[PDB]
Ligand SMILES: Cc1ncc(COP(=O)(O)O)c(C=O)c1O
């Protein structure tokens with residue numbers, strides 16, 4: 001139950017925000033994503049409560065730029081906008097959704113290693129807080145585009161800080177070998193920022209860093225914060241001031257329910273106490289974080305009805321109508337999600353749970369102890385609010401599923417499912433093939 | 435160039451079916467999927483040519499049931515139907531497309547480990563050649579559903595033959611621990627078939643087996659055939675005859691261009707020579723194969739325009755507008771696809787090629803030697819006709835790409851691209867979030 005603050009078992013049945021899950025499966029059909037509006041408010045409020053100390057002590061702003069890549073469903077993004085949340089967008093599509101969700105432009109940052117001219121025009125016209133520049137090539141394109149529109153673009157720089165490889169080898173290897181960011185150690189990040197200060201159509205406003213995802217140790221974050229701030233000091237020695245420090249996202253969520261993991265409070269104690277060590281060398285900046293998974297993952301549950309039970313010599317398989325095309329995490333990363341029967345039974349058994357796609361990897365969990373499974377039961381797969389519907393697809397010609405939002409106001413359909421007609425709605429047969 | 439029979443380098447430029455690739459990219463936009471109609475015809479003809487001896491020597495039919503999971507774009511499936519090809523479908527969605535494509539029901543087989551009652555009603559009403567039964571639970575549902583419709587359903591049985599785990603360890607493991615099929619060793623397959631023989635609304639027509647994918651060694655197929663036929667004998671001894679033997683799909687294609695791999699002829703020799711050895715124990719049946727990848731993979735090319743070149747201490751990156759959401763194989767399986775610049779250059783360099791998504795795994799190839807890359811150049815990613823568009827998605831809020839079909843009749847848009855409005859076309863904002 002760790003992290004799933006709004007669900008419960010009442011009278012032998014599973015509930016989400018007070019709504020009977022099996023009844024939700026019955027009214028809306030399966031497979032079905034259920035997103036808890038209150039759980040999202042709780043996750044968001046944990047960040048605000050944990051980090052308000054930043055504004056209290058420095059007088060600067062603290063901004064949560066929700067990472068849209070985790071779930072950009074329009075109702076979810078409008079909910080987050082209404083809570084006062086910002087947006088971390090990585091494409092023109094996400095920027096479009098953020099603006100249609102009414103997220104204030106000064107709370108929008110644009111990340112990405114292949115920003116196109118059209119996307120840059122869009123960000124400049126929307127006057128986003130900043131493009132987090134990934135390369136010198138991007139900086140040049142932004143300054144040239146800003147010049148064409150007769151405007152000045154705000155630019156922050158995504159840097160790859162000099163993380164201690166002895167203490168954090170995996171983080172370090174990622175920063176050096178992946179496609180993102182401006183290497184600090186080799187001098188690239190300083191070269192890019194000095195180039196931008198000589199350009200006439202960009203305005204230098206910050207540095208950004210994002211080190212990884214599903215990190216359940218506070219250590220990598222402390223090291224990221226130290227090395228990012230060390231670079232802010234290096235910039236200050238060159239006479240360069242930084243208005244914003246954006247430390248990215250990556251806080252892990254409790255997929256496994258048996259062990260405690262670091263919370264937003266732990267993250268803030270770590271970040272804030274580290275950044276304040278530098279207050280006599282540089283002015284404290286506005287602080288931005290880009291949580292994705294840690295705002296929405298625990299708010300999502302995927303319900304799948306059992307259509308077949310199959311005993312084999314090695315395992316008892318339970319086949320459900322949810323599948324890897326609906327939620328790709330287990331098939332793609334062999335990632336663990338907690339799974340239960342929505343109905344409490346007086347018998348338990350160990351089974352493996354699979355969807356119906358042709359892919360051997362279309363298995364949601366193996367050797368799981370669940371209350372006795374019968375055809376017609378509804379299973380709930382926990383913690384699918386992030387990289388769930390956002391990576392869903394039509395593999396095996398299956399429509400993407402419906403999604404509902406459970407709220408104190410009622411249960412609302414927030415994503416309609418796709419029909420067989422939708423599967424071919426972008427296909428066009430040429431005359432000689434009619 | 436192995437496998438890519440219809441492309442060429444002419445006058446320093448890449449051509450697909452005689453159409454200049456950079457010009458296709460300029461006319462239709464990038465990222466762009468290009469499917470070669472002639473390459474599909476060539477691949478299909480190789481199967482028909484290779485297996486013609488089956489009907490010559492046995493008087494029985496050889497049927498190609500194209501695996502729709504590889505690519506079910508409506509123009510592609512209508513092309514295969516016009517060629518006389520059958521269909522291996524795994525969902526109601528694929529059956530739907532097959533029937534709208536005019537594939538005759540007599541050449542349609544339905545695979546899947548979680549067939550729903552709704553899907554079974556469709557296959558029965560369409561009078562498909564066979565449901566490849568995956569479990570006893572499915573058999574029971576098929577019989578009950580047929581009774582309710584007043585119809586008789588045709589059933590084959592997907593079995594897991596007694597493959598030799600000493601000689602084929604990887605193959606034997608999958609067959610035992612994977613979620614598919616009826617185990618032969620344990621007596622489950624025989625029990626399922628004898629059960630069907632007693633049911634009033636099902637008609638027993640064959641046995642099916644599918645061992646894996648991208649197999650570039652004939653050995654596993656010989657083992658598969660031998661063990662499937664051994665079970666056919668065991669059935670004969672029980673007084674049970676088998677009309678169809680379907681050996682699945684899985685022949686590998688040449689992703690790497692440096693080494694020769696088994697062709698359809700090699701597969702036919704192994705399979706037909708192995709099956710004929712049973713001619714004195716059982717009557718030869720119709721033979722069905724379910725190739726997917728080997729029919730369409732080499733006919734598809736993905737063109738991506740280069741927007742940025744990025745030098746870093748570890749590698750020189752070329753950023754293109756094709757991404758993992760357009761084609762997931764490199765990101766999901768770290769699979770290799772041949773990649774070239776569409777313009778021949780007087781100089782080559784080693785570069786890594788990535789899309790623009792904010793996922794570290796969104797990289798198409800590393801340390802590849804390409805003709806000198808410049809911004810604006812178009813790269814071609816080979817062999818994406820299978821598990822390419824069929825696994826495409828909207829991750830990072832990116833629309834799925836356009837796809838064109840190059841033909842002797844002209845170049846036709848067979849898949850329109852998704853606009854920003856399409857990204858949110860299934861999302862619904864609840865009243866209190868308006
Ligand atoms: C630059 C950037 N910021 C933030 C995130 C959000 O990560 P998480 O969902 O792990 O918090 C990502 C994930 O890709 C990212 O790439």
Ligand SMILES: Cc1ncc(COP(=O)(O)O)c(C=O)c1O
Nearest residue numbers: 358501644647683684725726727
């Ligand atoms: C039963 C079945 N037949 C055929 C195929 C096609 O395989 P390939 O594309 O490797 O030929 C698949 C792929 O999952 C399959 O599951």
